[model samples]
Target: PEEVIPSRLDIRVGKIITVEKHPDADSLYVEKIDVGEAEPRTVVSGLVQFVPKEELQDRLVVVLCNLKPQKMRGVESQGMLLCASIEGINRQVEPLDPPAGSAPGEHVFVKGYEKGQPDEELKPKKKVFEKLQADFKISEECIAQWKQTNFMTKLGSISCKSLKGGNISLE
Candidate 1:
């Protein structure tokens, strides 16, 4: 069966230009990122507790580009940073990494689900994310996957540091 979900969802290789803790939200961090856009996008990620500020600055991470913009503690986020989190307490979350040499704006694909074009922005009522979330996970080798298919950029597969068999989450 054809899966339009992955194709319709726009994910990309994002490079963080700067990052700082959110002034209003203690646990959130705001970032200026380059995702192949003419202008850098601003994103709010809940990673202050899990990822250090030093690690987040100038990092190459995966981003969901087409999610509807939303405000987090008065800061508006244009996109979302995707991460892998271990199940249960601690929920140790880390941003998804792109392969080396990947460009700041490269598009991501789900192995075999790259046939169609993605939407400019996903509609919240569509429940696309809700449907896709259950299948986003990590394999035994700590590689990020979508229903067993490795997530990839043209350069190579995307993987995490130590979250073997971890689940993917939006941050």
Candidate 2:
């Protein structure tokens, strides 16, 4: 059987501008994404179970640029976070690493990998608004949680929630 292929599909990699908890859902969040030059897209994703709000502040994420907007839990979502599911409730993310050849609004062709690969200049750059650092040591509470429940299960985007630095990064 011949399958119908629709047109006007444009995919782009974006960086997450902000992440906030959804007022109505405990396991959902709304993310503001920057896809180059176009206005930032508001995206709703169910990643609260795995990621904390404080951790998602400034991170890079991939987006499906041309998809029509959809209303999600009262929020209009312009795009989706790229992720994969190992199971119904478990997810893994593909790196949102910047392509050396894309600018803020450059298009990334996944299917046309070889033909449309980005050049070194147009690649996305990680914007640095503030410098920060994080340190995590296993606490008894954390180890118990990991043993009892799932740890880091949500997917959609892999966020660079914490960087390595000191008070200077924050300043």
Q: How do the predictions measure up, each by TM-score?
A: 0.95, 0.54
Which lDDT tens digits does candidate 1 get at residues 1-171? 435467788999999999988989999999999998999999999999887899988899999998889998999999998888886765688788999999898989888877668887787877788688888898998899988998898999988998888988895
Question: Residue 141 error for model 2, in Å?
Answer: 33
Candidate 2 lDDT by residue in tens digits, 74-135? 88887776432223254432223333333444454322131432222211232111110122
Give me the runs in candidate 2 sitting further than 4 Å from their true place: 1-8, 88-103, 111-171
Candidate 2: lDDT of 50? Answer: 63
Candidate 1's displacement at residue 52, Å, is 0.9
Q: List the residue pairs that clash in candidate 1.
A: none
lDDT of 1: 0.88
TM-score winner: 1
